[PDB]
């Protein structure tokens, strides 16, 4: 429905933008340009060097059902070749426990998991589709805990919480089930629970760097876009060094932030203003009494413990002078959010409690993480509206807000965007 000769501007060279480029190009659209604000590609797949090995400041892992990322590796020749992930569980006092072996709670949890699985397989078919343009069951629009309570599956939250809340995506009291279950669908949940998890020796960034290089048009970097306007059936992009016209705009960058440098119409301003996000903070640490395994702290995943370390990543087992990254959240809709300063101190205090005291923090990043909307906004039909706007003034909406904030979901979405509107 769009001509192959169209000049397509793709904003952002993260996974979503690079995938958009890949799949446009493979569909015969050769006149695309990817515009990246920073000097690097990969976005939140960001794998810096330290003493000859790359550590992860952002994304780390995948599961075997990451089919779109497999397609990307097929193209780049990259392989899943990183160190194996292994985990223990700690209480907030640092004591090691084995929740799977609890003879009372364990069965309750796994019975709820069984029950939920069947609801997903029968009543809630369609729940796991990529994106939100196929309207999900109304129950899925409620916060996850409410969704679970409606079906008597509350205890299943013990299994779902670990790769969700600890992983920055927020808390089941408020995050709609729709996101939780598109990310952690039954198969994905099962893979995680099993530890069947992809990692990369060269970092998740590496395959995106390699993908960018395979493109007919590798991303243009250091592009400071000051204004985008969309008059006369055209797209006009003003940057600090040039201003140029395009036929189509594909956005893989934060849509609320897009309002600030664009001729955003009333609907764009109205809806994109409803976007909320997570403040997910990662500290790259050198530690004494080096851990022997990664640690998760369910106690610190409760909203009452906001800002505490929920998980830390043991990446390079053989070298106790390698980087251990820690993970915490600074926000929750029903709490005063936490400062960088007080959270950094909890990193220190928590790691000390866990028996792996921090000697040095070499890097720290609060990420713009998991853009989404509230249950109320989801229920009021946020996605019916925005997806209805796809193509308005030659503009297409993609990236994390349109799908889910993991790198397979956004790439899958970019791939399908080509199929939906372009081919
Ligand atoms: C700590 C952490 C851990 C994670 N763990 C995992 C994991 O284990 N597995 C997984 O699948 N996912 C994980 N993720 C999520 C995953 O990294 C993201 O969902 C994915 O990178 C999203 O891709 P994207 O292209 O939509 O957005 P992004 O990765 O954020 O890329 C956006 C790009 O657009 C650029 N940009 C922003 N504004 C502008 C502008 N004004 N003009 C031009 N360019 C702009 C940015 O610089 C960036 O390059 C993790 C993320 C973090 C932060
Ligand atoms: C199902 C996993 C794919 C998506 C993951 C998305 C976000 C992850 C965010 C942060 C992860 C912190 C990692 C700590 C190491 C885990 C070790 C283990 O689980 O065995």
DSSP state of 267: H
Q: What is the rounded distance in angstroms from the CA atom of residue 9 to the CA atom of residue 70?
A: 25
Q: What is the rounded distance in angstroms from the CA atom of residue 402 to the CA atom of residue 388?
A: 12
Residues 180, 186, 190, 193, Cα dihedral to 10°: 30
The resolution, in Å, is: 2.0
Q: What is the rounded distance in angstroms from the CA atom of residue 75 to the CA atom of residue 146?
A: 42
Q: What is the rounded distance in angstroms from the CA atom of residue 314 to the CA atom of residue 293?
A: 6
Nearest to 397 by CA among 386, 384, 408, 405: 386
Question: In the sheet where 32-35 sits, what is the strand order?
Answer: 32-35, 8-11, 248-251, 395-397
The CB of 167 under 6 Å from ligand 2? The reply is yes
Taken in order 225, 230, 235, 241, the sign of the CA dihedral is: negative
The closest-lying atom of ligand 2 relative to the alpha carbon of residue 311 is 14
Alpha carbon 28 to chain centroid, angstroms: 29
- How far away, in angstroms, is 410 Cα from ligand 1 center? 9
Nearest to 34 by CA among 17, 50, 51, 48: 17
Residues 396 and 325 sit within 8 Å (Cβ to Cβ): no
The CB of 406 under 6 Å from ligand 2? The reply is yes
- How far away, in angstroms, is 163 Cα from ligand 2 center? 6
- How far away, in angstroms, is 46 Cα from ligand 1 center? 9
Query: Judging by DSSP bridges, how do beta strands 87-90 and 294-296 pair with one another?
Result: parallel
Q: What is the DSSP string of 189-227?
A: HHHHHHT--B--TT-HHHHHHHHHHHSSSPPB-S--EEE
What is the distance between the terminal CA atoms of the chain, rounded to a whole angstrom? 6
Token pair listed for 230: 């969309």
**Expt. technique:** X-ray
Alpha carbon 121 to chain centroid, angstroms: 25
Token look-up 């950094």 returns: 344
Query: Judging by DSSP bridges, how do beta strands 276-287 and 324-329 pair with one another?
Result: antiparallel
- How far away, in angstroms, is 42 Cα from ligand 1 center? 7
The string over 344-359, giving b where at least 16 C-beta atoms fall within 10 Å of a residue's C-beta and e elsewhere, is: bebbbebbebbebebe
Nearest to 251 by CA among 390, 366, 404: 390
- What the chain holds in terms of domains, given with CATH numbers, is 1-76+195-274+370-423 (3.50.50.60), 77-194 (1.10.405.20), 275-369 (3.30.70.1990)
Q: What is the DSSP string of 299-340?
A: GGGSGGGTTS--EEEE--TT-TTS-EEEEEE--BTTBPPPPH
The CB of 61 under 6 Å from ligand 2? The reply is yes
CA-nearest residue, atom 10 of ligand 2 = 167
Residues 6+ apart with CB under 8 A from 272: 255, 256, 258, 259, 264
| Cα distances (angstroms) measured from residue 26 to each of 32, 70, 212 | 12, 16, 14
């Amino acid at each position: 429905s769009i001509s192959k000769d169209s000049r397509i501007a793709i904003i952002g060279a993260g996974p979503a933008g690079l995938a958009a480029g890949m799949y446009l190009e493979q569909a015969g659209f050769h006149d695309y340009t990817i515009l990246e604000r920073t000097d690097h590609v990969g976005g939140k797949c960001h794998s810096p060097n330290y003493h000859g090995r790359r550590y992860e400041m952002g994304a780390i892992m995948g599961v075997p059902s990451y089919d779109t990322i497999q397609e990307i590796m097929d193209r780049t020749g990259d392989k899943v070749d990183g160190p194996k992930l292994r985990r223990e569980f700690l209480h907030e006092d640092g004591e090691i426990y084995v929740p799977e072996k609890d003879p009372v709670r364990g069965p309750q949890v796994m019975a709820a998991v069984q029950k939920l699985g069947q609801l997903l397989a029968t009543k809630y078919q369609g729940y796991d589709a990529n994106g939100h343009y196929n309207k999900v069951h109304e129950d899925l629009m409620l916060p996850f805990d409410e969704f679970l309570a409606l079906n008597g599956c509350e205890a299943a939250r013990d299994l779902w919480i670990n790769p969700f809340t600890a992983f920055g995506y927020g808390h089941f009291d408020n995050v709609p089930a729709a996101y939780v279950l598109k990310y952690l669908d039954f198969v994905t949940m099962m893979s995680f629970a099993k530890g069947d998890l992809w990692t990369w020796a060269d970092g998740t960034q590496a395959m995106f760097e390699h993908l960018n290089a395979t493109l007919e048009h590798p991303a243009e970097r250091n592009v400071d876009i000051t204004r985008i306007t969309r008059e006369d059936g055209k797209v006009h992009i003003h940057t600090t060094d040039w201003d140029r016209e395009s036929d189509v705009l594909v956005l893989t960058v934060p849509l609320e932030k897009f309002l600030d440098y664009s001729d955003a119409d009333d609907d764009e301003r109205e809806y994109f203003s409803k976007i909320i996000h997570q403040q997910y903070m990662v500290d790259a640490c050198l530690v004494k009494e080096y851990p022997t395994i990664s640690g998760y702290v369910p106690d610190n995943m409760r909203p009452e413990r906001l800002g505490h370390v929920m998980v830390y990543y043991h990446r390079w087992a053989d070298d106790p002078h390698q980087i251990i990254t820690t993970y915490l959240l600074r926000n929750h809709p029903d709490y005063a959010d936490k400062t960088q300063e007080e959270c950094r101190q909890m990193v220190l205090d928590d790691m000390e409690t866990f028996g792996h005291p921090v000697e040095k923090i070499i890097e720290e990043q609060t990420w713009y993480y998991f853009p989404h909307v509230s249950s109320e906004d989801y229920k009021a039909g946020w996605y019916e509206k925005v997806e209805g706007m796809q193509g308005r003034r030659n503009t297409f909406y993609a990236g994390e807000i349109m799908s889910f904030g993991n790198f397979d979901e956004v790439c899958h979405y970019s791939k399908d965007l080509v199929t939906r509107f372009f081919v």
